[PDB]
Amino acid sequence: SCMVKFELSSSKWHMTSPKPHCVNTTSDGKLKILQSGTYLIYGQVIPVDKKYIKDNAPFVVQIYKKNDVLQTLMNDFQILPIGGVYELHAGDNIYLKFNSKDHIQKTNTYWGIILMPDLPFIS
Amino acid sequence: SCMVKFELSSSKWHMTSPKPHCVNTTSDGKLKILQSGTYLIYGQVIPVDKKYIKDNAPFVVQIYKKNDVLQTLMNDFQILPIGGVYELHAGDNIYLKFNSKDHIQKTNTYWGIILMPDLPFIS
Numbered sequence A, B: 001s002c003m004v005k006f007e008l009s010s011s012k013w014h015m016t017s018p019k020p021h022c023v024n025t026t027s028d029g030k031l032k033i034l035q036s037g038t039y040l041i042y043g044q045v046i047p048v049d050k051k052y053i054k055d056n057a058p059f060v061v062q063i064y065k066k067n068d069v070l071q072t073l074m075n076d077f078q079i080l081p082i083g084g085v086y087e088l089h090a091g092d093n094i095y096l097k098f099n100s101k102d103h104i105q106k107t108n109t110y111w112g113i114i115l116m117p118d119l120p121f122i123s
Helices: none
Strands: A003-007 A012-015 A023-025 A031-033 A037-045 A060-065 A068-074 A084-088 A093-098 A110-115 B003-007 B012-015 B023-025 B031-033 B037-045 B060-065 B068-074 B084-088 B093-098 B110-115
Touching: A003 A023, A037 A093, A037 B037, A037 B084, A084 B037, B003 B023, B037 B068, B037 B093
Parallel strands: none
Antiparallel strands: A003 A012, A003 A110, A023 A031, A031 A093, A037 A084, A037 A110, A060 A068, A060 A093, B003 B012, B003 B110, B023 B031, B031 B093, B037 B084, B037 B110, B060 B068, B060 B093
């Protein structure tokens, strides 16, 4: 059972155990994957209200795995759920990149991962 | 330990156990919470290429809890991760409504839930 949750407001991780077996975390909100497996990356990025962003810079969020883009997301400054099921390997780094971090409202913005268990049953 | 994933191409649920204690799933892709707790609702909704769009409806995806919309998402027909962390109660029906079923590439489109453990360990 391995899961972590980073709240950007406080810059703290919350975790299943004191020293999780599956991941290491950093206080800038990056993770390193210690256990290869199927992971669910999740989170919600809250944009600053668009009336307050006075140029034409798009609201963009990317999740990286090492130096590869796992996904690129953009909407018109509306709340953005992120992530999905990804196959990760020991040693992989996961981190988010923002078009501009001034777009991001720290309060209630969060992200993390959960090591998924196998799902061998089907109906 | 309780997780389910619905694959829209096959209309099958993939599950941690033969009869998950935490949730009831049905073959229309809906589900019902059996165990009160913190849940991570997740998924990715993949739109077809814009050149196949027949109708004039915008790309909108909603998650309902019982009869009220819980989450409303929309973009310019791009990949759409859904969900986030929500407190749900025994009895809550969770399901998805799309603006137009034709908008969806069933192949890589999935959603489901995981009952979340507590994350008591901080920093």
